[PDB]
Design a protein around this ligand. Structure first.
Ligand SMILES: COCCN1CCN(c2nc(SCCc3ccc(OC)c(OC)c3)c(C#N)c3c2COC(C)(C)C3)CC1
Ligand SMILES: COCCN1CCN(c2nc(SCCc3ccc(OC)c(OC)c3)c(C#N)c3c2COC(C)(C)C3)CC1
Lengths: 200, 41, 150, 160, 50, 160, 41
């Protein structure tokens, strides 16, 4: 499978198999966190892990893989709801966020009864209107009196990173560093090597 | 690595900004009475 | 005191409550909390009450599930997926300072730091724990069943 | 239209309420509400530039609630410079022919407002551009070496 | 899918989850929840918000 | 601008509404607006400072809502004494030159005014200032004998 | 022991207040009619 999956571009296609308990991999595969204590946020925790993806690869002799089970820092699309600008435009803030957070992601509303059964009711935008950064400015939002205000009047909207799957352990942010024990060898020194590559 | 790659051919781009018009008559001209009195017929 | 009691509860407690044998960490007294000390001779200056001080903090300091560009379901012909950050929970004393209260044609837009002395501090001040007359937090550990106190 | 007065209500010398609204529909204005910084940023791109115009000012089409355009189209007559206070938004005024009375004053009908033909549009598809670092777009162009180079760009208007 | 996922949900899941021996039934779709699709060029027509 | 009246509509002698609004755009005011305690404090910063010169008629620049600043600064015309009861306005007025009509009277633009400054006491780079404990930043300072001994400071206004 | 000290002196810091406010024209002269009648043309 995986050899022909090298031909498939645009996707790191691979495959694997299910053990009885499916969290190990290639018969010895260890697993490991790297927790943050000092309130450094996540990117400095990520810079620690970007340094220990490399340092995992600087010892292929004992740390035979750095398999990722998280996700790389995807772009995620900021909106500066320009607060100052928004209320002085007329439109209250509590109407903006119950638009922007209930047109795009789609709020629950209540139940309804289909065929004698309770089913949810999700207000959301149509798909072609919540679809681009250009479709910010199509959301017309009421001012204080009843004149409509576009979002592009007051939503300066840049990009930024964000890890779209943040793991936590011991109540603190942390990322799932994997690894197989060296091929055929023991994980006792590979788990020991991580605790002395924990000085880097 | 087999990497599909796109070479940028650039020039023509019709940009149309679609945006909500609020149509109004060409002469509204509300007939207001110039001169007081009962509207007889 | 409260500077300690947050440092303990942000760093120590979640590392002590999973040291083995510990099945309970009680913390003293509480964490920080953005204590909004209102100033009623500034609230009357702006014709506000603590209703509208609370109402803006439940508005402008509210984390909003914005959603995704390219969300589910897409349009046929989609190549872009993001996840929109709306107003986050506001993360600092200064970012509550510029919590807005009204339209401002006084505009240095009406600051919550013009009516309310923003600072951090504990969640209750009923406990002052002065260890040898010197301010202290604390934590009372309770050992789990499996009571291995050594 | 109606008769807001009836056959006998006392009216005054220039009262407040209209008697009846006559109405001329054969051309029709469409008051078109551009946002402020967008009408800013389009004139901004007319001095970057280029951007272009069509040499005859201008052309606006309609797309009402069906999803097919109007049987004809017409002229952006002018562009206001008064930003409205409580919308933050320029009101363009698009004048349209209507020999059919299939326009109705107030719809509020979407106006596709065409502007001038961005003449050198480096249209990278969206599948390749990712943001490295925070808020900085990087296409990953491979050179003539068959070696990739991560040249940063500035990612403008996502068109489609 | 969703035309099917309720038919799992409204008929099968409450019949398999009390078929004998069966513990937790995890449905993999959804119930057929009324999905209001808003349309912001119809909201600006009628001057509403969500 | 528009024609709020059209042909046929009766107008009245000094009527309430307006026919059309002629506007002149090349000198454009920006109603720069100030809090009440500030332009007390900045006028009590005349005894402590200020200092404004020469031509104590200050420069005002924008950060208009596309993020890029307006290309040229402008003259702060006056200072009102017209404190709005519900907000606290010391409403200023910055007249700006507007060459290409990139101002559009009626939007919001963030207007920063450049008050004069002779009392130029301290600056310090950001690394030497430990932010925490918040409220009381601590700069690590040498004593007299190379034995360092920190002081708390007032780290208020992070200039760059 | 080795520290890159920056020694504090008085440094001119003309940077002052940033704030908002709506722009308005110079000249926002309306046209009101001082003559009553039909807008004939
Ligand atoms: C709100 O408190 C309820 C808990 N009670 C039972 C445990 N008790 C106890 N607390 C402590 S240390 C308390 C740490 C602390 C820190 C900051 C505080 O200010 C926020 C604070 O006030 C509560 C306490 C000790 C000891 N040593 C003991 C008892 C009790 O007796 C011992 C011999 C175990 C010594 C404290 C009172
Ligand atoms: C509730 O969802 C979380 C459950 N997870 C663990 C089980 N895993 C698995 N799910 C499935 S079926 C997925 C059905 C489904 C249908 C509609 C959906 O749209 C809503 C949908 O999305 C959730 C999923 C299967 C199989 N065969 C297996 C696993 C896992 O491995 C197997 C070999 C057992 C085969 C799915 C993910």
């Amino acid at each position: 499978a995986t050899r022909a999956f090298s031909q498939i571009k645009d996707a790191m296609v691979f495959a694997f198999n299910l053990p009885a308990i499916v969290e190990l991999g290639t018969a010895t595969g260890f697993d490991f966190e790297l927790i943050d204590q000092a309130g450094l946020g996540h990117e400095k925790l990520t810079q620690a892990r970007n340094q220990l993806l490399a340092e995992a690869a600087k010892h292929p002799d004992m740390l035979t893989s750095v398999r990722p089970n998280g996700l790389e820092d995807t772009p995620q699309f900021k909106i500066d709801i320009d607060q100052e600008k928004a209320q002085a435009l007329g439109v209250s803030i509590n109407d903006i966020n119950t638009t922007l957070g209930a047109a795009w992601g789609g709020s629950y509303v209540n139940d309804f009864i289909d065929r004698g059964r309770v089913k949810k009711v999700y207000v959301m935008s149509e798909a072609k209107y919540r679809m681009l950064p250009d479709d910010i400015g199509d959301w017309y939002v009421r001012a204080a009196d009843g004149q409509m205000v576009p979002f592009s009047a007051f939503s300066s909207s840049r990009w930024e990173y964000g890890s779209p799957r943040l793991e936590r352990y011991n109540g603190l942010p942390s990322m799932e560093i994997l690894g197989q024990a060296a091929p055929g060898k023991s994980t006792g020194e590979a788990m020991e090597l991580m605790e002395q590559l924990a000085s880097k | 690595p087999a990497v599909g790659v796109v070479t940028v051919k650039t020039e023509p781009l019709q940009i149309t900004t679609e945006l909500p018009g609020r149509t109004s008559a060409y002469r509204i001209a509300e007939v207001r009475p110039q001169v007081s009195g009962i509207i007889l017929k | 005191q409260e500077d300690i009691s947050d440092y303990v509860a942000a760093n120590m407690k979640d590392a002590i409550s999973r040291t083995s044998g510990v099945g309970d960490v009680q913390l003293f007294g509480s964490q920080y909390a953005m204590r909004i000390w209102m100033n009623p001779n500034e609230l009357n200056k702006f014709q506000l009450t603590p209703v509208d001080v609370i109402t803006a903090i439940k508005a402008q300091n509210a984390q909003v599930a914005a959603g995704q560009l390219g969300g589910t379901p897409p349009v046929k012909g989609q190549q872009l997926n993001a996840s929109i950050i709306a107003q986050t929970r506001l993360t600092s004393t200064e970012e509550f300072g510029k919590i807005l209260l009204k339209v401002n044609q006084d505009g240095s837009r009406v600051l919550l730091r013009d009516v309310a002395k923003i600072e951090l501090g504990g969640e209750n001040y009923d406990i002052i724990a002065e260890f040898n007359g010197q301010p202290a937090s604390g934590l009372g550990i309770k050992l789990a069943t499996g009571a291995n106190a050594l | 239209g109606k008769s807001n007065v009836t056959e006998g209500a006392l009216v005054q010398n220039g009262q407040a309420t209209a008697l009846a609204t006559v109405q001329q529909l054969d051309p029709i204005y469409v008051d078109v509400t551009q946002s402020s910084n967008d009408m800013m940023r389009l004139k901004q791109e007319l001095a970057n530039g280029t951007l272009k115009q069509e040499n005859g000012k201008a052309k606006v089409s309609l797309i009402t609630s069906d999803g097919i355009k109007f049987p004809q189209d017409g002229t952006l007559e002018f562009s206001d410079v008064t930003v409205d206070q409580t919308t933050g938004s320029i009101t363009l005024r698009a004048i349209f022919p209507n020999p059919d009375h299939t326009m109705m004053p107030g719809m509020f009908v979407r106006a596709r407002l065409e502007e001038g033909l961005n003449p050198n549009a480096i249209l990278v598809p969206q599948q390749g551009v990712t943001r490295t670092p925070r808020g900085d777009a990087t296409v990953l162009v491979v050179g003539a070496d068959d070696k990739v180079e991560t040249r940063p760009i500035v990612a403008s208007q996502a068109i489609g």
